[PDB]
Design a protein around this ligand. Structure first.
Ligand SMILES: O=C(Nc1nccs1)c1cccc(CN2C(=O)N(CC3CC3)[C@H](Cc3ccccc3)[C@H](O)[C@@H](O)[C@H]2Cc2ccccc2)c1
Lengths: 99, 99
């Protein structure tokens, strides 16, 4: 069900039993969520954007339920200001940009 | 056209005589471009991203041909690693995000 970009395209995730809103972010390669715990273990990666570089912890094989679509992928948790869903998951729910 | 996000949603833009390519980014609110000689007056501004903030020159009333369509808007020109088309413009072309 489609979304116009007049608002920030936020939807709700369920990750790891928790419910958060998240930004659908077609310009991000990866998904980076704020700090919260997630079962499993991780290694560091380092990501950047405008502003520079944060250090995040990466977990693979994480289920996320977006709306009521389930996806499995990497998530990176770290000090992002905003929870972001990026192309790696965006591709799994089949999200297109139409114009 | 439709973009699938399996690759970067990169698009061709002409701004102010100059051809560049830029990322269609639904996460971003405003459009921010690498340093470019656009005609003249600006306000000084800062934007927030991941990593920190950057400091940009806010030019308004910039006309851009985006893909092959056009819009007038504010662009922020400053030291971004990648050029971002953001929703302030994406709405003017009527880009929808879609699942
Ligand atoms: O308007 C903006 N800000 C304002 N502040 C005050 C008033 S308006 C704004 C404009 C352009 C970029 C950004 C920051 N931004 C980003 O840095 N990223 C890194 C990706 C890894 C997460 C991607 C773009 C990108 C991609 C590759 C390389 C560099 C940048 C992502 O796609 C993009 O949406 C956002 C993610 C984001 C959005 C909003 C808040 C925080 C973060 C913000």
């Amino acid at each position: 069900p489609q979304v116009t970009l007049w608002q920030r395209p936020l939807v709700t995730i369920k990750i790891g039993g928790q419910l958060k809103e998240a930004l659908l972010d077609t310009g991000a390669d990866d998904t980076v969520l704020e700090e919260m715990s997630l079962p499993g273990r991780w290694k560091p990666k380092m990501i950047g954007g405008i502003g520079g570089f944060i250090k995040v912890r990466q977990y693979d094989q994480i289920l996320i339920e977006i709306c009521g679509h389930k996806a499995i992928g990497t998530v990176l948790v770290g000090p992002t200001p905003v929870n972001i869903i990026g192309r790696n998951l965006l591709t799994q729910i089949g999200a297109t940009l139409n114009f």
